Amino acid sequence: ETKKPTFMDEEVQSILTKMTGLNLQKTFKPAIQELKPPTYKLMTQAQLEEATRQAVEAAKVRLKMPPVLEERVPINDVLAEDKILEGTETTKYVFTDISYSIPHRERFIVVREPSGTLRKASWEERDRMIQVYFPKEGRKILTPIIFKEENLRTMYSQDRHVDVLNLCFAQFEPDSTEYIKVHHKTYEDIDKRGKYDLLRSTRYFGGMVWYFVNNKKIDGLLIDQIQRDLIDDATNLVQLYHVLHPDGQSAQGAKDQAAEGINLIKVFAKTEAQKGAYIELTLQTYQEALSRHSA
Amino acid sequence: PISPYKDEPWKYLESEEYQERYGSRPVWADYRRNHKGGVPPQRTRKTCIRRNKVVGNPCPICRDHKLHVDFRNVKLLEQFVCAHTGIIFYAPYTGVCVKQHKRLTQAIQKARDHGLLIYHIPQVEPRDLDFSTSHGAVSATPPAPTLVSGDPWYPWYNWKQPPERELSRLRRLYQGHLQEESGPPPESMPKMP
Amino acid sequence: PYPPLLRAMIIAERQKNGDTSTEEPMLNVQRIRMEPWDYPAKQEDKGRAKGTPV
Amino acid sequence: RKTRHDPLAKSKIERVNMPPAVDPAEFFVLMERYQHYRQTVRALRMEFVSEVQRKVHEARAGVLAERKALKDAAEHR
Amino acid sequence: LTQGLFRGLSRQETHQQLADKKGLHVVEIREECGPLPIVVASPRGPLRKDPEPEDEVPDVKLDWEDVKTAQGMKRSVWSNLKRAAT
Amino acid sequence: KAYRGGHLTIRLALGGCTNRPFYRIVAAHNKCPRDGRFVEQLGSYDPLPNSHGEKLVALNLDRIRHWIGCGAHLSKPMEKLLGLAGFFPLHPMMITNAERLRRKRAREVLLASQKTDAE
Amino acid sequence: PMKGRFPIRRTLQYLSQGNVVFKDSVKVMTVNYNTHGELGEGARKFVFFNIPQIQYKNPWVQIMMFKNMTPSPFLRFYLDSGEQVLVDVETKSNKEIMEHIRKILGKNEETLREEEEEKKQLSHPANFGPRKYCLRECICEVEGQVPCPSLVPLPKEMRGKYKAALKA
Amino acid sequence: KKVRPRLIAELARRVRALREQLNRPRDSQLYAVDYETLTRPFSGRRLPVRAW
Ligand code: FES
């Protein structure tokens, strides 16, 4: 019938890509790591334009937004129950098929409990064993202590939200509960303190827009874009909101009035936006300043 | 010597007694080792304090009892880390003893675990190419018949009492070397009350 | 029947390849003719004691 | 360990290892378990043996393999 | 040693002189900053429209000491030693 | 090296330090030393429980099925690891050793009960 | 400095830049070039720069050179089946020659990646052993597992010295 | 690479194999048994207790 666009649709990818923008200075910020003496080349105006172009192609590969998944379902499956083995052992065995040419989500990992029950390993146990025999740089077997409440607040206080997302992407899987909680908590702190610029020109901006839209918290973001002369992104945010929520006061009103450009913000501001008054004032200031420049 | 900054060591670096002694340079700047030759030993002394007794030329950490190596004193731990590569200097670089260089590396790694010290965190790639849990390994498997009826996987797991004619053969086969016949085992494992 | 794990890995290949079936995988033990341990062996392939009288 | 030429000890000269006692019930039940267990494993072994024979013959004499050997020879000409 | 040190440190060509000499952009490539081209110097005069002819093999005299190190062949128990700060 | 006769076997190769054993599953010739030369490594076994209280066992099933199809044998401890996993059936003596333990513990409950009852 | 003209040729970084990896058919490569003549200029540069690159990638291939035997230069390959591949290289640069033999007798990029991929499967990360072959030697290097006794002494209840004493 | 011949290693090998065929023990010597000590006098080995 009518399916609502997903996070990986070409239409949504292009919208979230444009909002993110491209900033080479922040995308390729000098890393604090082991250094080497740089290399120099004598280039022309055209050779410099091509090199700057190849950096744009490589930055769009570094800004690739990770896919957004739903919380994976627990694993509760028993392969066999051998009651004769009950009481013969004190601890449980964890068998792990280790074959190189197998994806880790198709890999068999079972557990023989002391009750003789041969079940499948839980998600927490699968991801742990896959790191013992197929280690990955950045991931640790034991959950770090940085992802705790008190420690995460410290990182937020230093405006290191992109660091928390990079730690979470290297330690947890996209469909894990911790990957979702840590991401969602970070998104809620930005909206509270208006730090939307931090995630700009990164691969974590789209996922942040996708969370506010589905939970209807685009008021703060929509304001920031207006305060930065980014109306094109501000209008695309309302267009996206209407798509995912067709049966909304703003969506229905827009169709009736056929609002376009700045009008969409006004229609959405009064009907559905919680901070309708503040938006109109902010949008008002911008439109006045824009008129002066046009003169 | 009882330092007043024992519990709050970060207050000594932001005081005037620290500025009048070190200034803006690190604590290990005006320190030189006493060794024979131009090339120094590749290891520093184990410790500058032996049974509450300090050596003639203590290291930058052992000479000032008000400098406490804690994971909270971020301003002191930054003097032992390169601001361009984020690498901890080896002891011969600064001149600290092995005992304090082992305490700094821990405190420096404990502050990076609490988010107090800034360090480079790369942007890694995903572990898996696909994210589909459409496989038996991660999903439910059709319970086998024997599992639904509460039966063992193979019939010969359970005890089966053999005929009498077969025991007589064994008794005849092993005459004078026998053991008391054992009956069917209990259904479940006993426990000590 | 196949043992627990092997059975679970044969049913997953079916579903991965697309074949949909509810039949149980089972081992054909009819070929395996288990003979008793006291069955006469071959004496024409058996060795002999060496000539080292003690 | 010892060799054939090394002699025997004087403490093992008058030694007789008596066989263990037999439980008629357990002995018979356990004598059938090995009979089935070993029959179930003899079939598994034959299965795996057929898979190693297949792949080898497939590799040197297969459809895909012979479909690529002709493509490489046709591209050479 | 001293008369030669001051001699080579005074006859070194900067990035600005090089650009003016060849009328081309001097771009800096760093591994830490990825493929981003950093312009360190540009000519004040007319920028040339033709590029430098790419050379298949450069006829530049090498130093066996540097080539022997890059190939993991210069063994020495005195190099890369831990020393004090300088 | 060439051994007279012999065959390939999938056994356990002890490792680790004193009071800290760590076995590594390997396919090696029958006459070769325990911890000597091997053909391939097919897994590992850590007897000592970890922090989570679980014993880890790695198995390269794809390769264990290859060597069993090439003429390789199995050792008793290794046949008991494949039965605990579900790859092989429960070894007959894994079952009988459990029955012996049951009768043994039921024989101790009597004496314990009699003492508390009689005395 | 390094002796000889164009010393960069005698470097591992330059010898590994060759992109001509012959197939299994190629067994012998014979080069016939003239020392003089404008037409044979490229053949001389091909013997001065690239033959080192070709022989380094194909060490089991015999390469024999002949001077001033014919009025014009040419290449000739001898395959294992008995077939000969004549290649006139007159009025051509060394790059055209290096690119031409790569198309008729050299392997493509698809055939190379495959071979490399096979090697990656020879070093299983799960395996434990010496640093030369494996990443980890023992499983005590894995956090969570019991550490080595050399670093962290084991509990008195887990040592065979006291297990025997406690029992007797 | 020219191995130096070992002729005595081949001479004795032939002699041993020959003597094993001319001095071979018979079934009367090999499989004899003393019914009091229950030992084969040829090798002086006791039979298993279950065969006595
Ligand atoms: S090396 Fe792993 S236990 Fe000693």
Ligand SMILES: [Zn+2]
């Ligand atoms: Zn000290």
